[PDB]
Every structure is written in C-alpha cells, then in structure tokens.
Amino acid sequence: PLLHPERFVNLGIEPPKGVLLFGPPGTGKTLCARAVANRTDACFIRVI
Amino acid sequence: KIMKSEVLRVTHELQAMKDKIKENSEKIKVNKTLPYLVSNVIELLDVDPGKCAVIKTSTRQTYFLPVIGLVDAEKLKPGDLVGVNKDSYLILETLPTEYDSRVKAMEVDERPTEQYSDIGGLDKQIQELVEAIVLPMNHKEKFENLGIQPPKGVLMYGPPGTGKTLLARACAAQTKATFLKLAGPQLVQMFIGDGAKLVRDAFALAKEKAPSIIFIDELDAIGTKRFDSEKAGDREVQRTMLELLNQLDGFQPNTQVKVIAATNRVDILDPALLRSGRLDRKIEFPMPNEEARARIMQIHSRKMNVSPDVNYEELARCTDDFNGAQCKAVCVEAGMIALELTHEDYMEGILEVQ
Amino acid sequence: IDGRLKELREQLKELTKQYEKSENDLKALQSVGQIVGEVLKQLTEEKFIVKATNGPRYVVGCRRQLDKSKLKPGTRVALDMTTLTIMRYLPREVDPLVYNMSHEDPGNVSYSEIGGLSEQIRELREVIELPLTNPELFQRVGIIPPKGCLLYGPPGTGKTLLARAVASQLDCNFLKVVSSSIVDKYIGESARLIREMFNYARDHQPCIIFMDEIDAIGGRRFSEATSADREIQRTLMELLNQMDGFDTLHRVKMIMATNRPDTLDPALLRPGRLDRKIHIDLPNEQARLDILKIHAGPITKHGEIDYEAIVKLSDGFNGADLRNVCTEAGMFAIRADHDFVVQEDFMKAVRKVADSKKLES
Numbered sequence: 001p002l003l004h005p006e007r008f009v010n011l012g013i014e015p016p017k018g019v020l021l022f023g024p025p026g027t028g029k030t031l032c033a034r035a036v037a038n039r040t041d042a043c044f045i046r047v048i
Numbered sequence: 049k050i051m052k053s054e055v056l057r058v059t060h061e062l063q064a065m066k067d068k069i070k071e072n073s074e075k076i077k078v079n080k081t082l083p084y085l086v087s088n089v090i091e092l093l094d095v096d097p098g099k100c101a102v103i104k105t106s107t108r109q110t111y112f113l114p115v116i117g118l119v120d121a122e123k124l125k126p127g128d129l130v131g132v133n134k135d136s137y138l139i140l141e142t143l144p145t146e147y148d149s150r151v152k153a154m155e156v157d158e159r160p161t162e163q164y165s166d167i168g169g170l171d172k173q174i175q176e177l178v179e180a181i182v183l184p185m186n187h188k189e190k191f192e193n194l195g196i197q198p199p200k201g202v203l204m205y206g207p208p209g210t211g212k213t214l215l216a217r218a219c220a221a222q223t224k225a226t227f228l229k230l231a232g233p234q235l236v237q238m239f240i241g242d243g244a245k246l247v248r249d250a251f252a253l254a255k256e257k258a259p260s261i262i263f264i265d266e267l268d269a270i271g272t273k274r275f276d277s278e279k280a281g282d283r284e285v286q287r288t289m290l291e292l293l294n295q296l297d298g299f300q301p302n303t304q305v306k307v308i309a310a311t312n313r314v315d316i317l318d319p320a321l322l323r324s325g326r327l328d329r330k331i332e333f334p335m336p337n338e339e340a341r342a343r344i345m346q347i348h349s350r351k352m353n354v355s356p357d358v359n360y361e362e363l364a365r366c367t368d369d370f371n372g373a374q375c376k377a378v379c380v381e382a383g384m385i386a387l388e389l390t391h392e393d394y395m396e397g398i399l400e401v402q
Numbered sequence: 403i404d405g406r407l408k409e410l411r412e413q414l415k416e417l418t419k420q421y422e423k424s425e426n427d428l429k430a431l432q433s434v435g436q437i438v439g440e441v442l443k444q445l446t447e448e449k450f451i452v453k454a455t456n457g458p459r460y461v462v463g464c465r466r467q468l469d470k471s472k473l474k475p476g477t478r479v480a481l482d483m484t485t486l487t488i489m490r491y492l493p494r495e496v497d498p499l500v501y502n503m504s505h506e507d508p509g510n511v512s513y514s515e516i517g518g519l520s521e522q523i524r525e526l527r528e529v530i531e532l533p534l535t536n537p538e539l540f541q542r543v544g545i546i547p548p549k550g551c552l553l554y555g556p557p558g559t560g561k562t563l564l565a566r567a568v569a570s571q572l573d574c575n576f577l578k579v580v581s582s583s584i585v586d587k588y589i590g591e592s593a594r595l596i597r598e599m600f601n602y603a604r605d606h607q608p609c610i611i612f613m614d615e616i617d618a619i620g621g622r623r624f625s626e627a628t629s630a631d632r633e634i635q636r637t638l639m640e641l642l643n644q645m646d647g648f649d650t651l652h653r654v655k656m657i658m659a660t661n662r663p664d665t666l667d668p669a670l671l672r673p674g675r676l677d678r679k680i681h682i683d684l685p686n687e688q689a690r691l692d693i694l695k696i697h698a699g700p701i702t703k704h705g706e707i708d709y710e711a712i713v714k715l716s717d718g719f720n721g722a723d724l725r726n727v728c729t730e731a732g733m734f735a736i737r738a739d740h741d742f743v744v745q746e747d748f749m750k751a752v753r754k755v756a757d758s759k760k761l762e763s
C-alpha cells in the first residue's frame with residue numbers, strides 16, 4: 001500500500017484494511033521497524 | 049380624502065419607528081454580540097401587580113431581570129444557554145443549547161452518501177420500509193392531506209450482514225434529511241440515568257435538526273425479554289428502556305424524526321415496544337439466497353475491473369449461508385489477492401474468519 | 403379611488419404599530435435588573451442582612467413600598483445592583499426533575515375518541531370520580547374511598563386510552579407506570595420507588611396512577627404464579643398498605659390495567675384491596691363499527707360508509723389493530739400515490755392485517 005502500485009484497480013479499491021503483527025515476546029515489531037526503514041519518511045511511532 | 053394625510057403620517061411613522069427599532073436593536077445587539085453569563089432559568093411567572101426570570105450567571109451569581117425584558121417566554125422555557133446581558137443583566141437572545149457531551153456528536157454523520165442501488169436482495173422489504181419512512185419524508189404533505197399520520201417505529205430484525213445499516217443510511221440520504229446513529233450496545237453506562245440523558249438529548253438533537261432518522265442499533269441489547277433470573281434481571285437498563293418509550297411519542301404531531309431499530313432476533317423483546325404508535329413495522333432481514341448473494345457481491349465488485357466475464361455461479365453455489373457482509377468480504381478478498389482471479393478467488397474469505 | 407385602500411393601509415399601520423410598541427417596551431426598559439439574595443437576618447426594622455446566593459452578605463435597607471411582613475426572614479429577595487438595597491421579594495421553587503409526571507391532564511376529546519363500551523367508560527367514571535372529586539365527605543362520614551379498578555382485555559380496547567379519557571371529568575394527571583419499572587430490584591425495599599412516585603402524585607395531587615402490566619402477559623408465558631414468585635404480589639401489597647396515604651387529603655387513585663385477570667393474587671381483590679374490577683374484552687360488533695367510524699373520522703376521502711362489511715371481515719380485532727387498519731388503508735392509498743381511498747382499500751387493509759395476525763398467532 002505504501003508503494004501504491006496496484007491497490008486502486010487490479011485489487012479491490014483499498015488494500016487489506018489492517019495488520020495484526022502479534023506473537024510471543026520476540027520478533028514482534030522488529031519486522032514493523034524493518035518495514036518502516038524500507039518505506040518512505042512516514043515512519044512509525046511506538047505507543048504503549 | 050383623509051388618506052393622503054393618513055399615509056403621509058403612516059409611512060413616516062413606519063420608517064422612523066423601524067429606524068428606532070434598529071437603533072434599539074443595535075445597542076442591545078452588540079451586547080448580544082457580547083453575552084457572557086449562562087441562563088439557568090429558574091422561571092417565576094411574576095405577573096405584574098406578566099412573567100420574570102432568575103438567571104444563574106457563569107460567574108456564580110443570580111440576576112432577577114424583570115418580566116424577561118427582551119425575549120418572550122414562549123420561546124424561552126426554563127433551561128440553559130440563552131444570551132444574557134453582561135452589563136444589563138437581562139436575557140438578550142436565544143442560542144443553541146448543549147447536547148449532553150456525548151450527544152453533541154457521538155457518531156452523527158452529517159450526510160450519508162451510500163446509494164440504494166449498491167444494496168439489494170431484500171428488495172421487497174427495502175421498498176416496504178421506503179414507503180413507510182422515506183415517503184413520509186418527501187411526500188409528507190401527502191400523508192398530511194390524506195389524514196393518516198405515518199408510523200415511526202420500524203424494527204429491522206435479522207442476522208448480521210443483512211444490510212440494515214446501509215439501508216438505513218441510504219434511506220436517510222434519499223430523504224436528504226438529518227441522520228443520527230445510536231451505538232446501542234454501549235448505551236449501558238454505569239452512571240445513574242446516563243443512558244436516559246443520552247436518549248433524551250439524542251431525541252432533542254433529532255427534533256432540532258430536521259425530520260431525522262434515529263438509527264438505534266442492538267435493540268435486543270437495549271431491551272430484554274423480561275427473562276428475570278438470579279444472575280441479573282435488567283434492572284437499570286429498564287430505565288433506559290422506559291425513557292425511549294416515553295420519547296417515542298414526542299414527535300407524534302408533524303410526524304418527523306423516524307425511529308429505526310436494528311437487531312437480529314425480534315423475540316428477545318417484551319410486548320411493550322411493539323405498538324401502533326411505537327415500534328410497529330417489524331421487517332425480516334434474512335440471509336440472501338444464492339441469486340441475491342451473487343448479485344450483491346457482483347455489485348460490490350462492480351468497481352473492480354480485473355477478471356472479465358465472471359458469472360459468479362460457482363460463487364453462488366459456494367456461498368452457502370453467508371451474509372451480505374460475508375459476500376462483500378468474499379469479493380474484497382479477491383480484491384486483496386487479484387494482483388484465483390476468475391471464479392476461484394472467493395472461497396477462502398469465509399474460511400479465514402474461523 | 404385611492405381612499406378605498408385606507409383599510410389595507412390601516413392594517414399595515416396596526417401590524418407595525420404592534421412591533422413598534424414591542425420595541426418601545428424593549429428599549430424603555432433597558433434595565434440592569436436586580437441581584438437575587440436571601441434574607442439571612444432581619445436584624446431590625448431599618449437594616450437587614452441579605453446574603454447573595456454566592457458569598458457576600460450586606461447590611462442593607464428595604465424597599466419603601468414593601469414591609470417587614472412581606473419581607474420575612476429566610477425568603478428570597480432582590481437587592482439593587484449598585485446601591486445594594488432591597489427592591490423586591492420573590493418566591494422560590496425546587497425540582498427533583500427525575501422520574502416525574504410525564505402525562506398530564508391536557509387531553510384530546512378521548513371521551514369521544516374511545517367510542518366502544520361507552521357504558522363501561524361511564525361505569526368506571528362513576529366508581530372513580532366521586533371520591534376523587536370530594537373525598538372530604540368520606541372522612542366526614544367515616545367511610546374509606548376506593549383505591550382504583552381493574553381492567554381486562556389484554557390486547558383489546560385501549561385500557562391506556564380509557565385511563566386518559568376518563569380523566570376528562572376528573573381534571574387529573576394520568577401517570578403511566580410499569581410494574582417492572584416500579585419494583586426494580588427483587589427486594590422488599592422496592593417500596594422506595596413507590597414512595598417516590600406517590601410523592602410525585604402528592605406534589606401533583608390530582609393524579610391517577612395508571613399501571614402498565616402487572617400480570618406480565620396474562621394470556622401466556624410467565625404469570626404471577628410462575629417465574630418471580632410472590633415478588634409482584636408483595637410489591638402490590640406495598641401499594642395496598644399505602645391506602646392510608648391520606649385518601650381523604652390526597653386526590654390519588656390507582657388503575658390496574660392488567661392483561662388477563664386470571665392470575666392476579668386473589669388476596670388482592672378483598673375489600674380494602676383493589677376491589678372494583680370492570681370487564682373489558684375484545685370489542686363487539688357495535689363497538690367495532692363505532693371505533694372504525696372514529697378511526698375513519700380524520701380520513702376524508704370518497705370511500706363509503708360500508709362499515710358493516712368491514713366489520714364482517716375484521717371481527718374480533720382490537721381497537722389498536724383497527725387503528726392500524728386505518729393507517730394501512732392510508733398506506734395503501736399512498737404507496738399507490740392515489741389521493742382517493744375507496745372501500746377496496748379498506749378491504750385490502752383488513753385482509754392484510756387479518757393475514758398478518760393469523761400468521762403471527
């Protein structure tokens with residue numbers, strides 16, 4: 001969705017409505033940080 | 049005759065005194081452009097040996113202006129939020145009141161844009177409630193000249209995903225009038241009389257803003273079937289229930305602001321909300337058949353142009369006991385994977401949820 | 403002749419002169435009014451202690467026209483805003499503003515809008531009104547006035563409509579109280595709520611308490627014997643012993659609009675109990691045609707007065723159903739966008755409601 005290459009037409013209107021990246025204490029939110037680095041300057045805030 | 053001198057005095061007296069009206073009005077209006085004190089009207093009908101008023105100022109004081117020196121008490125009833133002179137300690141002018149914090153804008157959509165065409169399957173039921181609700185809005189004068197006051201209480205009972213919410217908002221859009229949505233399951237507040245106050249100001253807001261659509265959801269949650277037990281007996285929520293009942297009769301004259309209640313099982317309600325003037329139009333909302341489900345998902349995916357010539361017949365065969373929401377989820381699941389494609393990217397949507 | 407338009411000019415001058423006198427009273431006042439206080443202490447004939455509602459109290463003089471007998475201690479008064487002297491004394495009120503009276507004496511020609519069983523309406527009025535009008539005679543001779551009356555006909559002729567209409571000769575405020583709403587929790591301390599509603603009736607002394615549903619669904623489901631055991635009956639016994647709530651002094655009665663009189667705790671029909679019960683059932687053919695006529699009263703269309711044929715198809719239909727019948731007839735005319743309602747529309751409405759109730763029953 002951040003690349004916005006295909007969300008509009010080929011796939012339905014909007015990309016999947018959400019993501020729940022859960023899991024036991026471990027890899028959780030490291031992939032979120034990696035996606036944040038790989039994406040644009042619109043970067044995450046870690047709220048508790 | 050005397051008309052020449054009469055009109056010569058008439059026009060001058062008219063224009064000069066209206067100028068005096070304007071002079072008066074401006075001298076109070078800039079004070080009306082500077083009101084400061086809330087108007088807690090402890091109304092005392094002191095007839096001159098006509099009326100009077102007691103105003104609780106915002107600065108914690110009491111001003112007993114005589115005979116309500118600027119405004120009529122027909123429009124100024126005992127309440128609050130009416131302009132009070134900051135210097136003359138007098139009632140200036142009415143102004144909109146406060147809609148009970150939450151009710152100020154709980155979830156009020158100013159105008160819904162969803163159309164009647166994108167929903168379907170229950171077209172007979174949707175046309176019935178259109179005749180019972182939307183027609184009393186557009187052709188309200190037809191009912192007025194007929195002599196029959198339209199009914200207000202329409203109860204849409206049926207399993208979730210049958211499109212009660214879209215239909216209600218589409219009906220409100222067709223009426224082009226105000227739409228107010230009530231989140232029923234969260235109306236159960238620990239505060240004493242909180243739900244009573246929320247329903248009171250919700251009806252007040254609907255009355256103040258056009259012939260509205262009061263769309264109260266989860267009527268089963270709001271009202272129990274009086275199946276009292278040792279665990280619970282619907283003690284407090286009965287207060288919220290009787291308030292709603294007493295507020296149903298407020299708009300009987302001029303027949304505006306319709307009540308639309310959405311639930312799944314009508315039978316969980318006692319035979320008290322069901323009445324001619326109260327909730328009367330109980331409309332079934334069944335799960336659509338294979339044809340209706342296929343048409344609904346086709347309409348939802350109409351804005352999707354990826355896989356040409358998909359008749360959705362296998363989808364209709366595989367859409368056993370699914371809702372309009374489930375059909376929408378099925379088609380947007382294809383609308384998430386179609387980067388399958390034709391007649392086979394639809395099944396997994398239902399399988400994902402469980 | 404321009405002089406014949408004098409009348410129109412006179413109307414214009416009168417119309418604006420009303421606005422001009424209104425504005426003259428609006429600007430001539432231009433007053434600051436008076437601050438409101440309470441008489442904290444009279445002190446003496448000359449100086450008085452008046453406390454503002456929000457702090458300071460002052461040693462002020464009194465209005466020349468007023469006297470100390472009109473001022474009194476602990477009474478709301480008005481002080482001059484600047485000179486700080488008593489200007490006028492005002493009465494005060496307090497309001498509980500919660501669960502108060504909702505329906506009042508103002509009412510429609512219900513006496514004529516009921517139609518059916520007018521004799522039954524007269525009988526209930528005969529039982530109720532006289533102790534309600536002049537209860538002092540009952541104390542004067544030493545007889546206890548009745549408490550109220552019972553009503554049958556679970557879905558039939560409007561019991562609530564009767565409770566409204568009968569108060570026409572009564573000039574009282576009918577109150578629609580629910581038995582579940584009044585008992586609340588399943589404890590004997592439910593008498594707190596009846597005390598509040600009776601106090602509300604004591605504040606609005608000419609008041610009839612119209613009960614909604616005491617024998618919860620008398621036709622089926624759970625009766626007084628089933629489900630809540632004796633909880634309803636004990637709470638009714640609370641209103642029973644309320645009968646000493648100054649029946650001579652208080653213009654309060656209680657109408658019990660049960661569905662079915664089958665399970666009503668026959669211990670509550672003894673002398674000193676609710677006592678009187680008036681029989682209301684589904685309207686007969688005569689009452690049915692009368693209520694059809696009054697329902698069609700507001701409807702002015704071509705149609706016909708063929709009410710008996712409508713009665714034949716719609717026999718044993720309650721007054722609310724027949725009101726729904728007339729509304730459905732209007733719905734049929736308007737769904738078809740016709741400004742005419744003919745007996746065929748009535749036939750369609752009667753057939754629709756008959757089929758609907760037949761399927762629902």
Ligand SMILES: Nc1ncnc2c1ncn2[C@@H]1O[C@H](COP(=O)(O)OP(=O)(O)OP(=O)(O)O)[C@@H](O)[C@H]1O
Pocket residue numbers: 023024025026027028029030031
């Ligand atoms: N796949 C991984 N590769 C490298 N380091 C990882 C990985 N998963 C977790 N870690 C390490 O775990 C630590 C915290 O990881 P992460 O930020 O994903 O979790 P968190 O925010 O602390 O919470 P939780 O453990 O509950 O998910 C870091 O030191 C990170 O390097």
Ligand SMILES: Nc1ncnc2c1ncn2[C@@H]1O[C@H](COP(=O)(O)OP(=O)(O)O)[C@@H](O)[C@H]1O
Pocket residue numbers: 166167168169206207208209210211212213214310333344348371372373374376
């Ligand atoms: N006839 C229909 N046409 C299009 N979408 C529908 C229809 N019925 C249901 N939906 C879908 O269902 C969702 C509404 O669900 P909901 O209002 O909870 O169902 P219900 O009103 O039966 O409780 C919407 O997001 C919509 O996409």
Ligand SMILES: Nc1ncnc2c1ncn2[C@@H]1O[C@H](COP(=O)(O)OP(=O)(O)O)[C@@H](O)[C@H]1O
Pocket residue numbers: 324325515516517518555556557558559560561562563693696720721722723725
């Ligand atoms: N005899 C009647 N005449 C006119 N209207 C009636 C009559 N009986 C019932 N109604 C209508 O029924 C509605 C409610 O009646 P209700 O008091 O619920 O009757 P019941 O208690 O027997 O069900 C009222 O709005 C009233 O207009």
